[PDB]
Amino acid sequence: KVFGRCELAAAMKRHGLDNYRGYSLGNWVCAAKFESNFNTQATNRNTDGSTDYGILQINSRWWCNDGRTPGSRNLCNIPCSALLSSDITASVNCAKKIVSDGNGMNAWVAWRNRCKGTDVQAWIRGCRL
């Protein structure tokens, strides 16, 4: 599914991401924009053989099982396929674990490089929330 900007802001708020670990909703919308362009079916293969899945491009080295990332973990206890669903529940619940890991949203390199310290409230401007 390709979400609209405000549609995704709403879904993320519905699932308790807004101000989760102190990160405002605009930070999460911005991260999703640059990770996936709001496409739940986004995938990206890394040089190490791991794969990133879904609207927040969650990686198979730690967070989900895809059966093809040797030595990896599955700390979200889900198949990586769950991260490609039109229903963002699995992505949001797994993102809550990731952002709790110690480095906050710096775990998403695209957030650090493209969203951190910018006027992220622009990402929810106009939205009925």
Binding residues for substrate: 101
List Cα–Cα distances, 16 to 12, 78, 98, 107, in angstroms: 6, 19, 15, 19
Instruction: Read off the tokens for 65.
Output: 């099982």
CB distance 94 to 14 below 8 Å = no
2, 6, 13, 24: which one binds Cl ion (CB under 5 A): 24
69 belongs to the binding site for Na ion (CB under 5 A): yes
Taking the complex as a whole, the smallest distance from the CB of residue 37 to Na ion amounts, in Å, to: 24
8, 10, 11, 32: which one binds Cl ion (CB under 5 A): 11
* Partners of residue 2 on adjacent β-strands: 39
Give the DSSP H or E segment for 45.
Answer: strand 43-45
Evaluate the CA torsion angle 88, 96, 94, 116 in order and state its sign: positive
Binding mask 70-109 for Cl ion (x = CB under 5 A): --xxx----x-------xx---------------x-----
Q: With respect to Na ion, which residue has the nearer C-beta, 4 or 49?
A: 49
Positions in the binding site for Cl ion (CB under 5 A): 5, 11, 24, 26, 65, 67, 69, 72-74, 79, 87-88, 104, 121
